[PDB]
Design an enzyme around this catalytic site. Structure first.
Site, mmCIF file in Angstrom:
data_model
loop_
_atom_site.group_PDB
_atom_site.id
_atom_site.type_symbol
_atom_site.label_atom_id
_atom_site.label_comp_id
_atom_site.label_asym_id
_atom_site.label_seq_id
_atom_site.Cartn_x
_atom_site.Cartn_y
_atom_site.Cartn_z
ATOM 1 C CE1 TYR A 36 0.847 0.035 4.554
ATOM 2 C CE2 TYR A 36 -0.083 2.258 4.270
ATOM 3 C CZ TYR A 36 0.402 1.643 4.680
ATOM 4 O OH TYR A 36 1.578 2.406 5.888
ATOM 5 C CB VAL A 37 4.674 2.189 1.116
ATOM 6 C CG1 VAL A 37 5.338 3.036 0.937
ATOM 7 C CG2 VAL A 37 3.446 1.930 3.337
ATOM 8 C CE1 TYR A 38 4.967 0.221 -6.895
ATOM 9 C CE2 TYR A 38 6.306 0.069 -7.036
ATOM 10 C CZ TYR A 38 5.536 0.014 -7.786
ATOM 11 O OH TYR A 38 5.728 0.284 -8.474
ATOM 12 C CB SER A 84 25.623 -22.855 -27.053
ATOM 13 O OG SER A 84 24.948 -22.236 -27.553
ATOM 14 C CG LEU A 85 27.170 -23.341 -21.226
ATOM 15 C CD1 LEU A 85 26.296 -23.780 -20.737
ATOM 16 C CD2 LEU A 85 28.307 -23.164 -20.875
ATOM 17 C CE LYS A 116 22.228 -25.829 -20.236
ATOM 18 N NZ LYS A 116 21.294 -25.331 -20.630
ATOM 19 C CE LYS A 311 20.986 -30.115 -21.442
ATOM 20 N NZ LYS A 311 19.965 -29.084 -21.639
HETATM 21 N N1 LIG Z 1 6.135 -3.339 -1.557
HETATM 22 C C1 LIG Z 1 6.718 -3.090 -2.245
HETATM 23 O O1 LIG Z 1 8.041 -2.477 -2.156
HETATM 24 C C2 LIG Z 1 7.182 -2.863 -4.550
HETATM 25 C C3 LIG Z 1 7.332 -3.284 -5.484
HETATM 26 C C4 LIG Z 1 6.620 -3.226 -6.444
HETATM 27 C C5 LIG Z 1 5.517 -3.478 -6.979
HETATM 28 N N2 LIG Z 1 5.121 -3.777 -5.498
HETATM 29 C C6 LIG Z 1 3.348 -4.618 -6.160
HETATM 30 O O2 LIG Z 1 3.503 -5.043 -7.142
HETATM 31 C C7 LIG Z 1 2.308 -5.275 -7.709
HETATM 32 C C8 LIG Z 1 2.608 -4.469 -9.343
HETATM 33 O O3 LIG Z 1 2.746 -3.063 -9.243
HETATM 34 P P1 LIG Z 1 3.904 -3.022 -9.892
HETATM 35 O O4 LIG Z 1 3.276 -3.170 -11.908
HETATM 36 O O5 LIG Z 1 3.735 -1.875 -10.591
HETATM 37 O O6 LIG Z 1 5.674 -3.672 -10.138
HETATM 38 C C9 LIG Z 1 1.424 -3.810 -6.726
HETATM 39 O O7 LIG Z 1 0.697 -5.101 -6.045
HETATM 40 C C10 LIG Z 1 2.536 -3.442 -5.992
HETATM 41 O O8 LIG Z 1 1.838 -3.310 -4.829
HETATM 42 C C11 LIG Z 1 5.048 -3.442 -4.073
HETATM 43 N N1 LIG Z 2 21.318 -21.115 -17.991
HETATM 44 C C1 LIG Z 2 21.481 -20.763 -17.702
HETATM 45 O O1 LIG Z 2 21.030 -20.614 -15.874
HETATM 46 C C2 LIG Z 2 23.448 -20.101 -17.791
HETATM 47 C C3 LIG Z 2 23.458 -20.520 -19.227
HETATM 48 C C4 LIG Z 2 24.661 -20.393 -19.098
HETATM 49 C C5 LIG Z 2 25.351 -19.920 -20.658
HETATM 50 O O2 LIG Z 2 24.815 -20.328 -22.196
HETATM 51 C C6 LIG Z 2 26.944 -19.636 -20.914
HETATM 52 C C7 LIG Z 2 27.462 -19.199 -21.803
HETATM 53 C C8 LIG Z 2 28.973 -18.929 -22.333
HETATM 54 F F1 LIG Z 2 29.164 -18.965 -24.148
HETATM 55 C C9 LIG Z 2 29.290 -18.689 -21.270
HETATM 56 C C10 LIG Z 2 29.126 -18.267 -20.590
HETATM 57 C C11 LIG Z 2 27.584 -19.513 -19.867
HETATM 58 O O3 LIG Z 2 27.419 -19.327 -18.618
HETATM 59 C C12 LIG Z 2 26.059 -19.525 -18.670
HETATM 60 N N2 LIG Z 2 25.275 -19.651 -17.614
HETATM 61 C C13 LIG Z 2 24.108 -19.945 -16.629
HETATM 62 N N3 LIG Z 2 23.949 -20.203 -15.133
#
Ligand SMILES: NC(=O)c1ccc[n+]([C@@H]2O[C@H](COP(=O)(O)O)[C@@H](O)[C@H]2O)c1
Ligand SMILES: NC(=O)c1cc2c(=O)c3cc(F)ccc3oc2nc1N
Length: 313
Positions: A36-38, A84-85, A116, A311
């Site tokens: 509510y503050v936000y 890619s990895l 990952k 993987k």
């Molecule tokens: N309490 C917080 O700091 C904070 C920050 C950003 C969004 N929110 C909440 O996220 C929802 C979406 O708001 P926004 O689309 O403006 O990010 C709302 O319900 C809002 O109150 C809360």
């Molecule tokens: N899916 C992931 O959460 C993730 C993916 C990559 C990458 O694809 C990747 C590709 C690179 F050439 C080098 C580092 C990387 O490190 C990465 N680190 C991760 N944590």
């Protein structure tokens, strides 16, 4: 009541306060104030922007809702290629990887291990702290310019904590909760559901209407510093900490491992914690921690020699 002069000043005050709250809520996953503050402050800002639209800025939290509609995506080159990895599937694969690394470096090597994240790989470029380009990995050297769509991803900062110029990379994904809600919505509208959150994230970022993307509830985890600019990190573990420092969302489950045996324990630890996470992961990424050593190992055509992705079967 409120003049343009007062509003111009007040608008900046609100953006700063509201952006800090969003940083805590979306980036740290730990809000400090109650919603509510936000909401109250957000409404005040909306009222100011409505009265004087010229005060709307790219970093105003009101812009998160999107509104732009593109005709298509511009090409987004990656001068610093997005590789890619290389994959690993068995304990022997991981130990074999370690043997090759030790053979090349000539001494034991520490590894930064990360989960990952199963999503879409993205690159974010900032200039003087301002978000200027967001792009998909695409084919590695050329992706799609999805800057406008990424402006709606709540965890992506529009203005960094420091006015630095850098390019970082990470994963954009859809949390399980949001994936479920979305498919139910598609079922309700006679649409084909997404097979998995990965496809949901990819399809979402392919949308040309940012207003739609904004409602998809995508999130991020940054893990690579591509263009350091002024950043000082010398190891991957240090880089993750620094990525957080400048304002990015990072995954808290990473661990620095001194031995391949500790790496395997990490793999088994999170292999069994897998279902408990709010997001899907298809494995573990094992990275040579020291950047000096990563540089020595280099890259094959397809991927770095300093990392391997274990993987999950
Ligand atoms: N309490 C917080 O700091 C904070 C920050 C950003 C969004 N929110 C909440 O996220 C929802 C979406 O708001 P926004 O689309 O403006 O990010 C709302 O319900 C809002 O109150 C809360
Ligand atoms: N899916 C992931 O959460 C993730 C993916 C990559 C990458 O694809 C990747 C590709 C690179 F050439 C080098 C580092 C990387 O490190 C990465 N680190 C991760 N944590």
């Amino acid at each position: 009541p409120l003049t343009l002069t007062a509003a111009t000043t007040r608008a900046q005050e609100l953006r700063k306060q509201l952006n800090q709250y969003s940083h805590e809520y979306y980036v740290k996953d730990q809000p400090s104030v109650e919603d509510y503050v936000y909401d109250r402050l957000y409404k005040e800002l909306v009222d100011i922007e409505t009265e004087f639209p010229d005060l709307i800025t790219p970093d105003s939290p009101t812009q998160r809702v999107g509104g732009k509609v593109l005709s298509g995506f511009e090409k987004a080159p990656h001068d610093i290629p997005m590789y890619s990895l290389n994959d690993g599937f068995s304990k022997e694969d991981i130990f074999a990887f370690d043997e090759r690394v030790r053979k090349a470096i000539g001494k034991p090597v520490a590894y930064c291990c990360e989960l990952k994240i199963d999503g879409l790989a993205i690159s974010l470029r900032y200039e003087n702290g301002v978000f200027v380009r967001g792009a998909t990995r695409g084919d590695g050297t050329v992706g799609e310019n999805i800057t406008e769509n990424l402006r709606t991803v709540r965890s992506v900062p529009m203005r960094l904590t420091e006015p630095i110029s850098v390019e970082v990379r990470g994963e954009c994904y859809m949390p399980k909760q949001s994936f479920v809600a979305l498919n139910e919505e598609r079922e309700e509208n006679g649409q084909d559901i997404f097979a998995n959150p990965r496809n949901a994230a990819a399809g979402s970022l392919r949308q040309l209407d940012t207003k739609i993307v904004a409602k998809r509830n995508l999130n991020t985890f940054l893990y690579t510093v591509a263009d350091f600019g002024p950043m000082k990190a010398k190891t991957q573990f240090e880089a993750l900490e620094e990525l957080s420092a400048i304002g990015f969302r990072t995954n808290p489950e990473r661990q620095l491992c001194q031995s391949i045996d500790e790496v395997w324990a990490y793999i088994e630890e999170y292999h069994e914690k897998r279902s408990t996470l709010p997001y899907e992961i298809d494995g573990i990424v094992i990275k040579v921690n020291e950047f000096a050593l990563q540089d020595e190992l280099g890259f094959t055509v397809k991927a770095p020699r300093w990392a391997i992705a274990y993987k999950f079967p």
